Ligand binder design. Structure first.
Ligand SMILES: Nc1ncnc2c1ncn2[C@@H]1O[C@H](COP(=O)(O)OP(=O)(O)NP(=O)(O)O)[C@@H](O)[C@H]1O
Ligand SMILES: [Mg+2]
Ligand SMILES: [Zn+2]
Lengths: 459, 799, 327
């Protein structure tokens, strides 16, 4: 549970080696000392894990821009050292979640056996590589290797999500309702490259809804406006008045009816299973929305939300934007979370009323009852020297592109404390009142109109 | 044949023999065959029981397995906690809920059969061993044959799947006692196997291993020319089916109705598939076969439909049948289920035209609101919910198309068009489902109605508001008016008030309906009103308690057996689709089992070890119920308190009743803690009063005083709780001199709680609070050197 | 608790039941207590007579206060005015004699006596109205006097005002249940509805929720729902809001607003005040609950109430001025 973190700290500048302030060199030297101390008694494990990390970094540094149009699978070049390594009985799979035991002895763990020779590519600005890892048991595992990006923030967000899950588990009101946050393992390897868990059996909600070829909206409502038409209309009114934006958004919403409720109908024909999946989806949406509001999660567009095909549970990815840094963006986010028409339509005929509202109230009560622990955790995060959570102009422009630290941290902590105590506009609001206010703000068409077209508020 | 390798597996899985001298050698042989690998844990025993279940559907043969499972559940309750924890990640396939479902299915199969009482008693005892444990699931799932599903997946053509289904059904019914049915099945098997489709099925299905292939070998024959099914062209194929009387005879004769409908479909010329035409002799002798084949016949007719004439005819006849159901006429619960199964089967079929699942849901032009209402009447809650959602979506799409509406408006249009309110129907559907959160989704309908308000108050445990509304409103029927009044009074304590109210009600009214007798017996046994003296649950419990007092054990066991059998029989006739419907039954069976278990202790001598073991078992099983609702745990605690008080009021000349007094005090403290957790204040106060009846105040204070202080704190009475705790601290300081290890934990907890309460109330400066309570508790817990304990470790950690 | 003496145990039980409403429960409890016990101490007879006259249990039939009140009420029903006045005189004399022997040092010792004497005086005053012909002017004057004297009691405790309101409600219900072939009982029905609305408001002020619900139920017994809504529906919505049931109150007020919008077309001056108050209260409740955006709340409730109160030109009134000021 610690070797990969220390190696990642010690391999901050190995990206250019394979291909600032004194604190960086001091941290690197201390990490090297820890690595030598670990290698003193168990050298084979340290050497094998270091070789695996070097192989991952080399694979990440591969350009592979020629196969952008290929989606069938490209054979890994024989020059990559990842192919040479096989049967690493001393390396546990970083993708898998390793259970923690009180005893120091670790046994019967799934170790890396070999890697498949074929790798896939995912859409995006940069090209990440999807590789398959075969464990000791012989079960394949899919791993996503990302380059030119920082993955430590994602790992920290996953840790906070794990803490939220543990807080929700120990309360009987949320344990009965099985309110959990879907999490995936993130293993940073350097300051520029890293590897993280690939959620098998999950599809983006935007891919399912507004796909150009076989989207849900096109399949179920051929006579309505296409996704491209709505996107173009929203981009046209971008440099216009607020009233014009509002009336354009209303016109688009009039000719764009939600069809997301059909996911459970076409995937779960049994009424009992369909009801179970719909209830699980509603509970997952309510819990994720409350957690995101508490942590100030932003940039929750269609491509950043994944839905499990088997369990119908939402999975949130790309957690770089948090602590209300999305409001500081050139196009501020006026919604605490994503509660668009598709999201409400997928909850059933009752909509936000019923399971969603009660689950949101229970989650907010749990958050309020554990305000001290959450505040302490956020204080621990905010003073991390390597946690680059503050918004910068480069990140602001990259997020929205078209064709004193102590004072900020204290302000963020005060805002979080006000959220945990129910203070919104200087007044004390109950759990039910706060939940109602958040639902109203999320479903308000006026707030959705101001949002960036890339966020796809109408979707 | 123990050494036979091919027979060893099936010998291992057979049910154990009855406990008798004659079955000795076979018993040891079976136990050593089964336990050859090694001892079996509770999970392994449950898995073995479930694997045995799928073999023979005869409840009489499973009596010994039921008793063995009861024994394992009784003496392996520790492993049940681990079993439940292991199923937390995936509660859908929990082994415990699967076992409960299998036991209930076995009880249903035992209905109307010889020796059913023993099977029902054994099942009730097994469900009494495991109580209403929160399974973290809402919908009951039924076990499905994996091999059958794989065989269905083997064939891609729909006709091949139909052939496989019919051949499997014929093979299954070939072992029936009826000889005409066997002859018809053999003739149909030969006819199907002689066709080209049967040959293609045999070629595709011969790769897999299945005994049905060997069973069908003699019937199959090799011929140069394939069997040809004659095709006749009727002048008007629609005249046979275009009859409203034919579709709805409904003369309380479902068998002849389904037989005539199947025959009329068969004689129609619309059918194109060859295998369906040869099923007439088998259909004419079995109604179940007709019900099974009817969806396939309808699908085959609709596939060959031209100009939508058959689709329109079937749509209007099915709609007329559903309207005749809605009416008030008085149809048989089998015809409605058959039509619901027909609709469900047709909903899963892909239409010939390219489309989505929503288009596939409308093979026939049907009003799904009526079908949902029928399904709700047939207790198909999830099916009714899905049909209601489909109807709402279809009507919204139709309105949008016509124009080129909220829930209340859509319900108003539904009422003004078909006479059925969508919001009301969704209300009863969600109430039947029983999921607490879904009740708030559809609440806009009948908001001002007193019944809805009272149900909301009862769901939210607003017993005072419910009592006020029950007393205020009068137009509500009396039987449920006093039923709610009594329930609200009992949930708030008020035992004397409830008893006087019952006496006055009996004085003013001579007629006595069973509900009021049930509530009167419940209050009589709960309040220990022993002078009040088919049989119902609480009446049986009261009779058993009096038999226990009078040492009439034979009638005590007979009454408990009758109550268990009645509870199981009442649970058998329910829908068995919602998990929440099992919790009251499981709680009642647990209470019956606990009373039966304490009966043997009462009968024989009273010893400290037996009482300690019984209390430990009760505490462990209560911990197994930590996620259960308070409504399912409160009756168990009340029965335990009544049992303990009955044990104490027994003549006790051995002067060792202090053990029972301590056990009752601990039980009442635990009950107070549980009620405090569920935001209840009347029950903890009653428990404190009951403790104070049997206890007093001495130099050495006890835990129930701290529990009373906590209860007073929960009642928003901070001054009283602080004064009580300060008096407790002063008495502890004056009494103990670091000499009593037992008082160490009480002193530390009292100091810590008082310091926390003072800090919360801001009634003292931090310096004095630290000097007097917190650091004092830490010093008491640490410097006393009363180490080597776990409770001390927990107290030190909390301090 | 059981060690407490029984006489005060059931005295407290009856008092607690009465203060929470529960008239049927209290009556059944009294019947069961009389069934299980033959000895009848004066305190229990006093409480039984109090419940009998408060619940209009007229089939129950020195003299005490509530017994005298019950006898006077039966004499009023039977038109036996001589014994009605004799009973009221005896009750007044007994109350004064009982007050004479007290210490007369604490002002709080006078309030129950003053309240009892006020109730006796009000019953005596309404006796002459009952005896002679019933006219609109006499009932209006009596109600105006009752309202003025209640305003004189605005600082009195609820324990001294509740019996007076209960006696007024009983008197009005007895007047209504009298045979009325002149078809002018609607005036008494309106007076009772206004009195019960005032009682609900007073109980709401004193943080009481059972009594306002009972008053609303009593109003609904004699009233129904028509195209033109009335004030007691708004009072019921306020009562439900006081019961921490925000959804029910909001739904009731929204239904009231929809019915007002569909019914009135700026033609009923009486409905103007009800519509303005309902819109203002609903807008304030929505703002407090944060269940709607400020733009919609302003567009639908607040500015709509202001427009209704101002543009209708139903001026020259004081209630309209108060409603406009509040909006
Ligand atoms: N953990 C994951 N599991 C499964 N699919 C994932 C995961 N992370 C990303 N994806 C897929 O990758 C797609 C692109 O997202 P991502 O890999 O974050 O690249 P990106 O959009 O360019 N983000 P960024 O690099 O932060 O600007 C998503 O739409 C998903 O389909
Ligand atoms: Mg992304
Ligand atoms: Zn009928």
């Amino acid at each position: 549970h610690t070797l990969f973190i220390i190696l990642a700290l010690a391999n901050a500048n190995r990206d250019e080696f394979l291909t600032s302030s004194q604190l960086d060199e001091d941290r690197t030297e201390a990490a090297n000392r820890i690595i030598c101390t670990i290698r003193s008694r168990r050298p084979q494990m340290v050497r094998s894990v270091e070789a695996l990390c070097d192989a991952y970094i080399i694979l990440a540094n591969l350009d592979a821009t020629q196969w952008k149009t290929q989606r069938k699978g490209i054979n890994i070049p024989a020059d990559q050292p990842i192919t040479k390594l096989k049967n690493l009985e001393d390396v546990v799979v970083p993708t898998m979640e390793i259970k923690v035991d009180h005893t120091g002895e670790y046994g019967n763990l799934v170790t890396i056996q070999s890697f498949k020779a074929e790798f896939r590519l995912a859409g995006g600005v940069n090209l990440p590589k999807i590789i398959d890892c075969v464990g000791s048991d012989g079960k394949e595992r899919r791993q996503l290797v990302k380059g030119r990006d920082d993955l430590r923030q994602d790992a920290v967000m996953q840790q906070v999500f794990q803490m939220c899950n543990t807080l929700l588990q120990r309360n009987t009101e949320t344990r009965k309702r099985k309110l959990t946050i879907c999490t995936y393992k993130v293993v940073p390897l350097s300051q520029r490259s890293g590897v993280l868990e690939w959620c098998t059996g999950t599809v983006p909600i935007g891919e399912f809804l507004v796909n150009n070829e076989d989207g849900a909206h096109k399949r179920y409502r051929p006579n309505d406006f296409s996704a491209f038409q709505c996107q173009k209309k929203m981009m046209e009114v971008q440099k216009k008045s607020f009233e014009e934006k509002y009336e354009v958004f209303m016109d688009v919403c009039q000719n764009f009816q939600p069809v997301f409720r059909y996911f459970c109908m076409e995937k779960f024909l049994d009424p009992a299973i369909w009801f179970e999946k719909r209830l699980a989806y509603t509970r997952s949406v309510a819990t994720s929305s409350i957690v995101g509001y508490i942590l100030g999660l932003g940039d929750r567009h269609v491509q950043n939300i994944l839905i499990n095909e088997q369990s119908a549970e939402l999975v949130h990815i790309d957690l770089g934007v948090a602590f209300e840094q999305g409001k500081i963006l050139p196009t501020p986010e006026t919604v605490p979370f994503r509660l668009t028409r598709d999201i409400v339509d997928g909850m059933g005929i009752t909509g936000v009323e019923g399971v969603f509202r009660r689950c949101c109230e229970k989650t907010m009560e749990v958050m309020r009852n554990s305000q001290e622990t959450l505040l302490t955790i956020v204080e621990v995060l905010l003073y991390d020297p390597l946690f680059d959570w503050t918004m910068n102009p480069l990140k602001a422009l990259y997020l929205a592109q078209r064709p004193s630290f102590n004072k900020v941290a204290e302000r963020v902590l005060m805002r979080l404390q006000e959220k945990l105590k129910g203070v919104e506009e200087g007044t004390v609001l109950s759990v039910g009142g706060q939940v109602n206010l958040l639902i109203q703000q999320a479903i308000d068409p006026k707030n959705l109109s101001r949002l960036f077209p890339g966020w796809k508020a109408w979707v | 044949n123990k050494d036979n390798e091919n027979l060893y597996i099936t010998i291992k899985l057979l049910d154990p023999f009855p406990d008798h001298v004659v079955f000795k050698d076979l018993r040891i042989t079976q136990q050593k065959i089964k336990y050859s690998r090694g001892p079996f844990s509770l999970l392994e025993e449950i898995n073995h029981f479930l694997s045995v279940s799928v073999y023979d559907a005869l409840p009489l043969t499973r009596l010994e397995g039921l008793k063995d499972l009861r024994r394992q559940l009784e003496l392996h309750k520790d492993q049940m906690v681990d079993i439940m924890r292991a199923s937390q990640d995936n509660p859908q396939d929990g082994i415990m809920v699967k076992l409960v479902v299998n036991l209930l299915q076995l009880s249903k199969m035992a209905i109307n059969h010889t020796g059913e009482k023993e099977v029902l008693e054994a099942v009730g005892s097994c469900l009494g061993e495991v109580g209403p444990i929160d399974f973290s699931t809402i919908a009951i799932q039924h076990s499905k044959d994996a091999s059958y599903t794989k065989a269905l997946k083997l064939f891609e053509d729909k006709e091949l799947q139909w052939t496989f289904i019919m051949l499997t059904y014929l093979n299954n019914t070939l072992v029936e006692d009826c000889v005409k049915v066997r002859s018809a099945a053999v003739t149909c098997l030969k006819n199907i196997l002689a066709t080209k489709t049967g040959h293609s099925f045999w070629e595709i299905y011969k790769m897999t291993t299945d005994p049905m292939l060997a069973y069908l070998q003699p019937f199959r024959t090799s011929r140069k020319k394939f069997l040809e099914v004659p095709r006749f062209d009727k002048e008007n194929p629609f005249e046979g089916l275009d009859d409203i009387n034919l579709w709805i005879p409904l003369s309380e004769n479902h068998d002849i109705w389904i037989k005539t409908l199947t025959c009329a479909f068969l004689d129609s010329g619309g059918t194109k598939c060859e295998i369906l035409q040869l099923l007439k002799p088998m259909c004419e002798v079995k109604t179940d076969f007709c019900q099974t084949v009817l969806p396939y016949l309808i699908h085959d007719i609709l596939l060959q439909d031209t100009n939508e004439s058959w689709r329109n005819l079937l749509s209007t006849h099915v709609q007329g049948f559903f309207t005749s159901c809605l009416r008030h006429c008085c149809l048989d619960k089998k015809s409605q289920r058959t039509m619901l199964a027909v609709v469900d089967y047709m909903r899963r079929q892909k239409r010939p035209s390219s489309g989505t699942i929503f288009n596939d849901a409308f093979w026939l032009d049907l009003n799904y609101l009526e079908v949902a209402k029928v399904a709700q009447s047939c207790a198909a809650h999830f099916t009714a919910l899905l049909y209601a959602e489909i109807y709402a979506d279809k009507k919204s799409m139709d309105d949008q198309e016509k124009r080129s509406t909220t829930i209340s408006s859509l319900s108003e249009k539904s009422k003004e068009e078909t006479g059925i309110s969508l919001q009301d129907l969704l209300l009863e559907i969600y109430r039947s489902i029983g999921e607490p959160d879904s009740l708030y989704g559809c609440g806009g309908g009948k908001m001002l109605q007193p019944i809805t308000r009272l149900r909301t108050y009862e769901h939210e445990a607003m017993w005072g508001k419910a009592l006020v509304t029950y007393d205020l409103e009068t137009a509500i029927p009396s039987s449920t008016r006093q039923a709610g009044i009594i329930q609200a009074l009992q949930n708030l304590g008020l035992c004397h008030i409830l008893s006087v109210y019952l006496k006055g009600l009996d004085y003013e009214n001579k007629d006595w309906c069973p509900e009021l007798e049930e509530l009167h017996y419940q209050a009589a046994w709960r309040n220990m009103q022993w002078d009040h003296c088919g049989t119902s649950y609480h009446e049986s419990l009261y009779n058993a308690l009096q038999s226990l007092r009078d040492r009439e054990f034979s009638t005590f066991y007979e009454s408990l057996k009758y109550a268990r059998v009645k509870e199981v029989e009442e649970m058998c006739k329910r829908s068995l689709e919602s998990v929440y419907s099992l919790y009251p039954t499981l709680s009642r069976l647990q209470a019956i089992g606990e009373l039966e278990s304490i009966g043997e202790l009462f009968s024989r001598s009273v010893t400290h070890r037996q009482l300690s073991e019984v209390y430990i078992k009760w505490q462990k099983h209560s911990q197994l119920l930590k996620d259960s609702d308070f409504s399912f745990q409160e009756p168990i605690m009340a029965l335990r308190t009544v049992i303990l008080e009955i044990l104490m009021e027994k003549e006790m000349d051995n002067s060792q009743r202090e053990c029972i007094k301590d056990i009752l005090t601990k039980h009442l403290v635990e009950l107070s803690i549980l009620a405090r957790t569920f935001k209840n204040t009347q029950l903890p106060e009653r428990a404190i009063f009951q403790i104070k009846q049997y206890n007093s105040v001495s130099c050495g204070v006890s835990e129930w005083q701290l529990e009373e202080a906590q209860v007073f704190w929960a009642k928003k009475e901070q001054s009283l709780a602080l004064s009580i705790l300060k008096q407790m601290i002063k008495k502890l300081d004056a009494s103990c001199a670091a000499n009593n290890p037992s008082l160490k934990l009480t002193y530390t907890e009292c100091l810590r709680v008082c310091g926390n309460w003072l800090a919360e109330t801001c009634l003292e400066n931090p310096a004095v609070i630290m000097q007097t309570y917190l650091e004092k508790a830490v010093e008491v817990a640490g410097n006393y050197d009363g180490e080597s304990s776990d409770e001390l470790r927990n107290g030190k950690m909390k301090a």
